[PDB]
């Protein structure tokens, strides 16, 4: 092509969305945003094909511009806004709060949470660097730049972010024995505990994870997301607790 594409064929859309192949010819193309295209759920899909509150695109537009939907504690009006993993969606009129977490099948599951849980989210530390004026900052998996991080917070760690103000309440190191969640690959959506981080210079690191059933599997480090210490997750987990 000669420039960015603006259309997405239904057969080319991510499989986990569950879009009927015969319903139409095109699927919602996620706009630019915090999460990548393939790992995101546009709000139209969530409101129409998952919650069934809206019957087609147009009532979804109506709902959004009514400002009844809040993502990340902020009102969003773009139908194709790319909501993604660990994003908090609030519908105050219905008094409903959702956290986007994959099921064991690998599909974003409608997981209802309390307001107290909705007050905070988790972000994997993708980068830690000194910015201008010598101010350290951390970039999380959702593109949030948080300045003046705790200097122990390192790459691959996870930080608890307050939605209202966007500061780091607490953090978890990436160590053996911590509780992790798989965000990619065939093991997607599984929950377990670390056993070893196998390290390859100049190559992709590999992590061995043991589930509650004692089964062990290996996944690339990029697909691992720490969510707590064993037996004490910092977020409510979906039904099944990431087993199988």
């Amino acid at each position: 092509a000669r420039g960015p594409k603006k259309h997405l064929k239904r057969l080319a859309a991510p499989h986990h969305w569950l879009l009927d192949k015969l319903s139409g010819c095109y699927a919602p193309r996620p706009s630019a945003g915090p999460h990548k295209l393939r790992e995101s759920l546009p709000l139209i899909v969530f409101l129409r094909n998952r919650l069934k509150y809206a019957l087609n695109g147009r009532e979804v537009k109506a709902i959004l511009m009514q400002r009844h939907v809040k993502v990340d504690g902020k009102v969003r009006t773009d139908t194709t806004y790319p909501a993604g993993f660990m994003d908090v969606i609030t519908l105050d009129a219905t008094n409903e709060n959702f956290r986007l977490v994959y099921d064991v099948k690998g599909r974003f599951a409608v997981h209802r949470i309390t307001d107290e849980e909705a007050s905070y989210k988790l972000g994997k530390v993708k980068k830690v660097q000194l910015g201008k004026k010598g101010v350290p900052y951390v970039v999380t998996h959702d593109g949030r730049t948080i300045r003046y991080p705790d200097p122990n917070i390192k790459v691959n760690d996870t930080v608890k972010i307050d939605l209202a103000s966007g500061k780091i309440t607490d953090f978890i190191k990436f160590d053996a024995g911590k509780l992790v969640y798989v965000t990619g690959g065939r093991n997607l959506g599984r929950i377990g505990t670390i056993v070893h981080k196998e390290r390859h210079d100049g190559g992709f690191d590999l992590v061995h994870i043991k589930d509650s059933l004692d089964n062990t599997f290996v996944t690339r480090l990029n697909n691992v997301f720490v969510i707590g210490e064993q037996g004490k997750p910092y977020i409510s987990l979906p039904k099944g607790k990431g087993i199988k």
Binding site: N97, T114, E116, E117, L237
Partner: peptide, 16 residues
């Protein structure tokens, strides 16, 4: 922490 607990009924009329 525990997840939030889960939470209109059919109505019938006969005429003619």
């Amino acid at each position: 922490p525990r997840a939030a607990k889960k939470r209109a009924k059919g109505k019938n009329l006969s005429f003619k």
